[PDB]
Design an enzyme around this catalytic site. Structure first.
Site, PDB file in Angstrom:
ATOM      1  CG  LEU A 166      -1.747  -1.253   1.531  1.00  0.00           C
ATOM      2  CD1 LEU A 166      -2.431  -1.116   2.993  1.00  0.00           C
ATOM      3  CD2 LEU A 166      -2.774  -1.688   0.377  1.00  0.00           C
ATOM      4  CG  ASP A 217       1.504  13.838  11.066  1.00  0.00           C
ATOM      5  OD1 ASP A 217       1.087  14.728  10.322  1.00  0.00           O
ATOM      6  OD2 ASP A 217       2.431  12.710  10.872  1.00  0.00           O
ATOM      7  CD  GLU A 236       8.549  -2.537   0.714  1.00  0.00           C
ATOM      8  OE1 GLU A 236       8.996  -2.205  -0.514  1.00  0.00           O
ATOM      9  OE2 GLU A 236       8.392  -3.554   1.376  1.00  0.00           O
ATOM     10  CB  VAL A 237       2.335   0.501   4.583  1.00  0.00           C
ATOM     11  CG1 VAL A 237       1.027  -0.087   5.513  1.00  0.00           C
ATOM     12  CG2 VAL A 237       2.975   1.419   5.715  1.00  0.00           C
ATOM     13  CG  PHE A 259      11.692   6.031   7.826  1.00  0.00           C
ATOM     14  CD1 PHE A 259      13.002   6.427   7.932  1.00  0.00           C
ATOM     15  CD2 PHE A 259      10.729   7.055   7.592  1.00  0.00           C
ATOM     16  CE1 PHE A 259      13.540   7.883   7.941  1.00  0.00           C
ATOM     17  CE2 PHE A 259      11.081   8.658   7.600  1.00  0.00           C
ATOM     18  CZ  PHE A 259      12.634   8.817   7.790  1.00  0.00           C
TER      19      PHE A 259
HETATM   20  C1  LIG Z   1      -3.252   5.291   2.641  1.00  0.00           C
HETATM   21  O1  LIG Z   1      -3.481   4.398   1.497  1.00  0.00           O
HETATM   22  C2  LIG Z   1      -4.351   3.147   1.659  1.00  0.00           C
HETATM   23  C3  LIG Z   1      -4.301   2.378   3.037  1.00  0.00           C
HETATM   24  C4  LIG Z   1      -5.411   1.371   2.885  1.00  0.00           C
HETATM   25  N1  LIG Z   1      -5.516   0.665   4.234  1.00  0.00           N
HETATM   26  C5  LIG Z   1      -4.795   0.867   5.536  1.00  0.00           C
HETATM   27  N2  LIG Z   1      -5.310   0.262   6.483  1.00  0.00           N
HETATM   28  C6  LIG Z   1      -4.832   0.321   7.752  1.00  0.00           C
HETATM   29  N3  LIG Z   1      -3.808   1.022   7.944  1.00  0.00           N
HETATM   30  C7  LIG Z   1      -2.984   1.536   6.628  1.00  0.00           C
HETATM   31  N4  LIG Z   1      -1.892   2.234   6.749  1.00  0.00           N
HETATM   32  C8  LIG Z   1      -1.297   2.532   7.945  1.00  0.00           C
HETATM   33  N5  LIG Z   1      -1.683   2.009   9.240  1.00  0.00           N
HETATM   34  C9  LIG Z   1      -1.130   2.492  10.460  1.00  0.00           C
HETATM   35  C10 LIG Z   1       0.218   2.290  10.961  1.00  0.00           C
HETATM   36  C11 LIG Z   1       0.878   2.834  11.847  1.00  0.00           C
HETATM   37  C12 LIG Z   1      -0.125   3.360  13.116  1.00  0.00           C
HETATM   38  C13 LIG Z   1      -1.451   3.489  12.691  1.00  0.00           C
HETATM   39  C14 LIG Z   1      -2.060   3.170  11.461  1.00  0.00           C
HETATM   40  N6  LIG Z   1      -0.061   3.072   7.654  1.00  0.00           N
HETATM   41  C15 LIG Z   1       0.119   3.429   6.384  1.00  0.00           C
HETATM   42  C16 LIG Z   1       1.252   3.859   5.548  1.00  0.00           C
HETATM   43  C17 LIG Z   1       1.184   4.271   4.043  1.00  0.00           C
HETATM   44  C18 LIG Z   1      -0.006   3.462   3.393  1.00  0.00           C
HETATM   45  C19 LIG Z   1      -0.996   2.842   4.125  1.00  0.00           C
HETATM   46  C20 LIG Z   1      -0.894   2.842   5.545  1.00  0.00           C
HETATM   47  N7  LIG Z   1      -3.795   1.335   5.629  1.00  0.00           N
HETATM   48  C21 LIG Z   1      -5.686   0.739   2.055  1.00  0.00           C
HETATM   49  C22 LIG Z   1      -5.383   1.425   0.534  1.00  0.00           C
HETATM   50  O2  LIG Z   1      -6.014   0.879  -0.527  1.00  0.00           O
HETATM   51  C23 LIG Z   1      -6.794  -0.209  -0.725  1.00  0.00           C
HETATM   52  C24 LIG Z   1      -4.740   2.825   0.484  1.00  0.00           C
HETATM   53  O3  LIG Z   1      -4.678   3.174  -0.419  1.00  0.00           O
HETATM   54  C25 LIG Z   1      -3.485   2.709  -1.302  1.00  0.00           C
END
Ligand SMILES: COc1cc(Nc2ncnc(-n3c(Nc4ccccc4)nc4ccccc43)n2)cc(OC)c1OC
Length: 272
Positions: free
Chosen positions: A22, A135, A29-30, A27
């Site tokens: 995603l 943030d 990937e997610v 730092f």
């Molecule tokens: C934004 O983009 C998206 C996010 C998500 N879904 C999702 N669901 C939970 N956490 C995170 N998610 C978290 N969670 C996170 C990490 C640390 C603390 C609290 C929450 N950190 C992230 C950093 C970068 C991208 C996603 C993250 N992403 C689904 C997507 O498409 C289907 C999408 O678009 C591509």
């Protein structure tokens, strides 16, 4: 902190299957993935050497203390390298992105206000638990498959022991979303988040537009010092604009509480 063999959050890495990325960054990937095959989760992996593992896991430790329906929930951690932080998955991604999709674009002002109140509700919890986010912005609000919103990215979040947190003199923050006191003195309070919330509201009603249209950061600061505030966004209900203005009052102490914001937005919603 409980050692990993006793910590209820630690899980064997074998329980996870990474399926789709995603996000990829400096730092780490997610990824979207599955826990024990059936449960959809988000997996944050730390890039070795990119940053301290202690710094990385610190966000997870804070999330253990801040659990609420309106906040993205911590799922588990893998504290043996490579490090992972697993969390609740939000199907519709970030709010800033969602509002730009065909679905998001069709949302009524009524639903936008609903979401705004959901966000204030989450911040009200953070407010009551003596924490600050720092943030707060549309990019850090995730949307569920049922169009409900939750607060995310607790990287800068901090437990406030005394009224405020003082950042490091070198610490830099998004100028357009950050309160004057914070940009100038590095002093953050729940009231700083309130200011950010005001900016976030403009992101909601403009379906993700960057705040202070056509203005550079220096221009934003100059105008603010004059007493000006963001120009009324196109098609922004006046009542909402006036609520935004409350969030942008000069003195932090004059800004409303998040519970107040929640109450008002809920009235705005049930009226529309
Ligand atoms: C934004 O983009 C998206 C996010 C998500 N879904 C999702 N669901 C939970 N956490 C995170 N998610 C978290 N969670 C996170 C990490 C640390 C603390 C609290 C929450 N950190 C992230 C950093 C970068 C991208 C996603 C993250 N992403 C689904 C997507 O498409 C289907 C999408 O678009 C591509």
């Amino acid at each position: 902190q409980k050692p990993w063999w006793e910590d209820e959050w630690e899980v064997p890495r074998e329980t996870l299957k990474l399926v789709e990325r995603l996000g990829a960054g400096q730092f780490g990937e997610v990824w979207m993935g599955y826990y024990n095959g059936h449960t959809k989760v988000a997996v944050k992996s730390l890039k070795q050497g990119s940053m301290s593992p202690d710094a990385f896991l610190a966000e997870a430790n804070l999330m253990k203390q801040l659990q609420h329906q309106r906040l993205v929930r911590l799922y588990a951690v893998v504290t043996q390298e490579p490090i992972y932080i697993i969390t609740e998955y939000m199907e519709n991604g970030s709010l800033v992105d969602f509002l730009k999709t065909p679905s998001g674009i069709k949302l009524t002002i009524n639903k936008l206000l609903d979401m705004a109140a959901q966000i204030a509700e989450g911040m009200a919890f953070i407010e009551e638990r003596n924490y600050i986010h720092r943030d707060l912005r549309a990019a850090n609000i995730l949307v569920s498959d049922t169009l409900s919103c939750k607060i995310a990215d607790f990287g800068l979040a901090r437990l406030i022991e005394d009224n405020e947190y003082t950042a490091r003199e070198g610490a830099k923050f998004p100028i357009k979303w950050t309160a004057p006191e914070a940009i100038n003195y590095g002093t953050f309070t729940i009231k700083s988040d309130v200011w950010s919330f005001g900016i976030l509201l403009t992101e909601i009603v403009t379906h993700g537009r960057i705040p202070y249209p056509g203005m550079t950061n220096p221009e934003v600061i100059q105008n603010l010092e004059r007493g000006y505030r963001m120009v009324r966004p196109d098609n922004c209900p006046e009542e909402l604009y006036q609520l935004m203005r409350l969030c942008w009052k000069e003195r932090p102490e004059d800004r409303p509480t998040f519970d107040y914001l929640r109450s008002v937005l809920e009235d705005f919603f049930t009226a529309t």
